[PDB]
Ligand SMILES: Nc1ncnc2c1ncn2[C@@H]1O[C@H](COP(=O)(O)OP(=O)(O)OP(=O)(O)O)[C@@H](O)[C@H]1O
Ligand SMILES: Nc1ncnc2c1ncn2[C@@H]1O[C@H](COP(=O)(O)OP(=O)(O)OP(=O)(O)O)[C@@H](O)[C@H]1O
Ligand SMILES: [Cl-]
Ligand SMILES: [Cl-]
Ligand SMILES: [Cl-]
Ligand SMILES: [Cl-]
C-alpha cells in the first residue's frame with residue numbers, strides 16, 4: 001500500500017493555507033513544502049541517502065518541522081531525541097537506532113556526538129547551495145519515525161507512516177475537523193503528543209501554533225492573537241487556569257489521570273486521554289460530556305481495548321491490552337520484546353486496569 | 366488489515382446517536398445494530414452462510430439499511446440491484462454475480478427470479494425468529510464488501526468489487542475534504558443502490574453521523590425534512606439542485622454542503638447558487654472509485670467554470686495519451702489512483718487487463734488538467750466523434766443545445782460521410798426554428814462542431830440510471 005507524500009499533496013491542494021505559526025511569523029503549506037524540499041536537497045549533499053536513519057536534537061523551531069519533513073522527502077527514518085535527557089541516554093539511542101547523522105544547532109554540543117555519528121548543523125546547513133529527486137510516495141508500512149520509550153532499557157518504537165495516518169484519522173472521527181481549526185502546541189515535538197500534531201496538520205490541512213515552551217503570559221495571548229481552538233497539554237499546564245473561564249476560541253483541551261474535581265466546569269472543555277509512544281498518541285478518550293465518570297474514556301474508532309491471563313469480566317482487574325492500525329507492529333532490534341510484547345495481534349501494555357459496565361477504561365496507579 | 370465492524374463499534378461508542386431518520390421515525394446506532402443482528406440471524410436460518418452472495422432489491426427503506434449491514438455481519442457479499450432494471454437485465458446480474466439469495470419485498474415479482482436464486486421477503490423475514498449466532502466482529506479491509514454494477518452506458522455492465530477498505534477510505538478522504546462535526550446530518554434522497562447513496566450508509570457508522578433517508582426526491586419533502594431535522598449535508602444531481610433553487614429564496618440555514626455529482630452545473634445555475642447562498646461542491650467520480658474522487662469547493666465555482674476540482678486527500682489523477690503523460694490543457698484519458706479505487710472488476714478479465722497500468726485505473730473518460738492541476742472532464746472516450754481533425758465532444762454540443770430554453774433534453778451522435786458528421790437529437794419545451802437555432806449554435810461553437818441535422822423525439826434512449834445512450838440515437 002502507498003500514499004502520495006502528505007506534505008507535497010497538502011501543498012498542491014491548499015497551498016496558501018497556513019501550516020505553521022511560530023513566534024509571529026507564518027509558513028504556508030506552499031512555503032513548508034519549499035522549505036522542506038530545500039533542506040532535503042542540502043542534506044543530500046552531505047551524503048545522506050534513502051534508507052538512512054537520522055536523529056534530530058532540536059527545540060521547537062520552524063527548522064525542526066522542516067527537518068522531519070526533509071527526512072520523509074528523502075526516505076530517511078527520523079529519530080527525535082529528547083533534549084532533556086543526559087548526553088549518555090542519547091548516545092545509547094544513537095547507537096541503538098543505527099543513526100548515521102544527527103541534526104542539531106549551536107545550543108547543543110556537536111563535539112559530544114561527532115565520535116559516533118556524522119554531525120550536521122541546521123543553521124549552517126540552511127545557508128548551503130545544493131543540486132534532487134524527492135520521494136513523492138510514502139509507504140504505509142515503512143518506518144517513518146523511531147521514537148524511544150524509557151521501565152528497562154528504552155525500546156525504540158518503530159512508528160510507521162500508516163500508524164501516524166490512522167492516528168490522525170482516528171482523532172478526527174473522535175473530535176471532528178473544521179477548516180478554521182487551529183492546534184496549539186506548547187509541548188516538546190520529540191514527545192508524541194506534539195509530533196502527532198505535525199502529521200495531523202498536513203493531513204487535515206490544519207494550522208499548528210508552535211511555542212518553544214509553555215509560558216502562560218505568552219500562551220493565553222497567542223490563543224487570542226491567532227484564535228486557537230485546539231490545545232494539547234499535561235495537568236501542570238492546565239493547572240494554570242489563572243484566568244479565569246476558557247476563551248471563546250477553545251473547543252478542546254487534550255490531556256496522566258485527572259486530579260480531584262474540576263475545577264472547572266466553568267469553563268474549559270477538557271478531554272482526558274490514554275495513550276503511549278506505542279499507540280502514536282491517544283488511543284482512548286473521555287469527552288467532557290461525562291467529565292464526571294471517574295475515567296479514561298472508550299476506544300477510538302478503529303481501535304480496540306481488552307482488560308485481561310485472561311479475558312476479565314466487567315469491573316475486574318487485569319492487564320490492559322491495545323489493538324488498532326495506529327499501534328506499532330514491532331520495536332526496533334528487540335526480538336525478545338517483540339515476542340514478549342504481542343499476543344495474536346494485541347499489544348501487552350503492562351498496565352493495570354478494568355472496564356466498567358459500559359466499557360470505559362480505568363487505569364490504575 | 367482488519368477493523369472492528371463499523372456498526373458494532375459505533376454501537377459500542379455512541380449508542381444513542383441517531384443513525385437513521387426514516388419518515389420521522391428515528392433509529393439509534395444501538396437499535397440499528399440490533400435490527401441488523403436480528404435480520405442477520407433470520408437470514409442465517411435460510412442456509413445463508415458466510416461467503417455466499419446475497420443480492421438485494423429494495424426501494425430506500427430502513428429494512429434495506431438493515432439488510433446491507435446484516436450481510437456484513439454474516440460475512441456475505443451484498444449485491445445491490447437497480448430497481449428500474451428490466452427482468453432480463455436483473456436476471457443477468459443475478460447470474461453473473463453468482464448470487465445465491467435475493468432479499469426483496471412484495472413490491473416486485475419474486476417468483477419471476479425464483480428459479481435462479483433462493484428469494485427471501487424482507488418483511489415476512491422480520492416476523493419470524495431463529496437461533497442467535499455470532500458474530501461477525503471483524504471486517505477484513507481487502508474483502509469485497511459490496512458488489513455494484515456499472516450502468517452499462519457503453520456495453521454489458523461490469524460488476525465492481527468494492528472492498529471495506531475502499532469504503533472506509535472514501536469516507537475518510539471525504540471527511541478530510543469537507544470537515545466533520547457532532548452537529549452534522551446527511552440527507553440521502555437518491556437510491557441506496559447507487560454509490561452516491563450507499564457511501565452515506567458507511568459515512569454514518571464511521572463518523573457516527575445521522576443519515577436522513579428518503580424513499581425518493583420530492584422537493585417539498587426534502588425542504589421540510591431539511592429544516593425539521595436540521596440537515597447540514599445533502600447529495601444531489603443537477604435536476605435536484607435546479608429544483609431546490611426554484612422553490613426557495615435563500616438556502617436553508619442548516620445546510621453547509623451540497624455535494625453535486627453526475628456532471629458540471631452550467632454557469633447560470635451556479636451564479637444563482639452563489640446569489641441565493643447555496644454552497645455547491647461539484648464532484649467527479651464513478652462506481653469504480655466508490656463515490657467522489659475529485660471535488661471543487663464553492664470558492665472556486667465561478668473562477669473554474671466547468672471543472673470537477675482537485676483529488677481528495679490520498680487520491681491522485683493524471684492524463685495520458687498513447688502511454689505518455691499529457692501537458693496542461695492537452696486532451697487525454699483521465700486516470701485515477703487511490704485506496705478508494707476498486708482493486709479489480711468482478712469476472713471481466715479483458716476489462717481488468719485493459720483498465721490498469723500501475724495501480725492507476727483507466728476511467729475511459731477524456732479530460733485535461735489546467736496549469737494549477739484542476740480537472741476538466743470532457744466526455745466519454747467512446748462517444749468521441751472524429752470529423753476529420755475532430756474532435757467533437759457530444760457533451761460540449763449538448764450543453765449549448767440545452768438552455769435554449771426550447772430544448773429540454775439534448776443528445777448528439779456521429780453519423781458517417783465524406784469522416785463522421787454530428788447529428789443532434791432534441792426534446793422540446795416549445796417550438797424552435799431549426800436553425801436558428803443553428804445560429805444559436807453558431808455563436809457558441811466552432812463551425813465543425815455544430816450539428817448538421819436536427820431530429821426531434823419525446824424521450825431519448827436512457828438506461829436504468831437515466832443515462833443517455835448516444836450509440837443508439839441512430840433510431
Ligand atoms: N494519561 C495516562 N494515564 C495513565 N497512565 C498513562 C497515561 N499516559 C501514559 N501512561 C502510562 O505511560 C505509558 C506511556 O509512556 P511511554 O510508553 O512513553 O513510556 P513507558 O511505556 O512508561 O516506558 P517503556 O519504554 O519502559 O515502556 C503507558 O504504558 C501508560 O502505562
Ligand atoms: N462531474 C462529472 N463531470 C462529468 N462527467 C461525470 C462527472 N461525474 C461522473 N461523470 C461521468 O459518469 C460516469 C460514472 O458513471 P457510472 O460509473 O455510475 O456508470 P457508467 O460508468 O456510466 O457505466 P459503464 O462504465 O459501465 O459503462 C463517469 O465515468 C463519468 O463519465
Ligand atoms: Cl488554498
Ligand atoms: Cl479540513
Ligand atoms: Cl451516546
Ligand atoms: Cl481515499
Ligand SMILES: [Cl-]
Nearest residue numbers: 173176546547
Ligand atoms: Cl464526530
Ligand SMILES: [Cl-]
Nearest residue numbers: 752753783784
Ligand atoms: Cl467535412
Ligand SMILES: [Mg+2]
Nearest residue numbers: 515651728729
Ligand atoms: Mg464508465
